[PDB]
Design a protein around this ligand. Structure first.
Ligand SMILES: [Br-]
Ligand SMILES: [Br-]
Ligand SMILES: [Mn+2]
Length: 299
């Protein structure tokens, strides 16, 4: 009853990435742009496809953010303009810090037939937004199990278990899977806002149903929340301290002013060293859409 005044639920939409691969896009949406520093969230799969038809995202840039890939099922090859080459497998995280700028590709091996993943972006704080880019791979995320749930701490600290993933603002991300039918209350930090998304199956958060077509978000203020999860179903919990500074998110860029975006777009179109090259990629380099002359910030 008390918790429900801090809860909002809204549908999430289908969208295409790479060469027509259909995914679900949860953030940004018309009702919610950010949860802590989390400023983008795609749910990919679960899906099975013919070998050779997996995700193929060609060269494209990012600025002012970190991309965060949580691979649940299947594999993906990450390549970037720093020369990183990393195959990500189930139960692993890739963290690419774009900062001042980087470009990358994400391509499924030609023998791969499955894909289940959550792809997020993290807005860098003002003091780190232009840092040198880097790429980090995490093959082992810690697991804490209680109340019939197996919690994998992806980032931050949850149930006194801290992920090795290094981020620059107060943030948390946890994958939860039920080992048995359960209903329990899980702890929350009152200074954080949160989002819940069903990764596999359905669940309930304070009585609100989580499906593959919605998301439940919480305002700051709660110390705990009740969830219901049948055995085998999986949920993603993300959260963080409200990001105070207004940001501009357009295409693959997170910035602060229109001039930042104009500059970066021009540099991409002109093959500027800022974004480097990915010489081993076979195919088309992705193109920047038109940049509107005016756009609203995150707040
Ligand atoms: Br799958
Ligand atoms: Br599947
Ligand atoms: Mn990307």
């Amino acid at each position: 009853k008390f918790a429900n005044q801090f809860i909002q639920e809204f549908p999430i939409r289908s969208a295409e990435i790479g060469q027509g691969t259909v995914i679900k896009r949860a953030l940004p949406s018309r009702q919610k742009r950010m949860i802590g520093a989390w400023c983008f969230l795609d749910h990919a799969g679960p899906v099975t496809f013919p070998a050779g038809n997996g995700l193929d995202v060609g060269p494209h840039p990012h600025i002012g953010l970190q991309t965060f890939t949580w691979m649940i099922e299947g594999t993906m090859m990450h390549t970037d303009s720093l020369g990183s080459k990393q195959l990500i497998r189930p139960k692993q995280v890739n963290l690419m810090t774009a900062g001042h700028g980087i470009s990358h590709t994400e391509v499924a091996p030609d023998t791969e037939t499955q894909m289940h993943a959550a792809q997020l972006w993290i807005a860098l704080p003002d003091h780190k937004r232009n840092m040198d880019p880097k790429f980090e791979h995490y093959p082992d995320l810690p697991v804490v199990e209680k109340d019939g749930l197996e919690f994998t701490v992806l980032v931050g600290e949850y149930l006194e278990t801290t992920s090795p993933v290094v981020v620059h603002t107060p943030l948390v991300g946890v994958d939860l899977i039920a080992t048995q039918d359960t209903k329990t209350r899980i702890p929350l930090n009152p200074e954080f806002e949160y989002g819940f998304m069903a990764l596999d199956g359905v669940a309930h958060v304070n009585g609100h149903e989580l499906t593959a077509d919605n998301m439940v978000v919480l305002d700051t203020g709660l110390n705990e929340i009740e969830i219901e999860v049948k055995k085998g179903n999986r949920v993603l919990l993300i959260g963080g301290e409200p990001f105070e500074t207004p940001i501009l998110l357009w295409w693959n860029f997170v910035a602060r002013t229109m001039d930042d975006l104009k500059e970066a777009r021009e540099q991409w179109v002109n093959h500027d060293v800022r974004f480097g090259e990915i010489p081993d990629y076979v195919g088309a380099r992705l193109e920047a859409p038109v940049l509107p002359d005016q756009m609203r910030a995150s707040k």
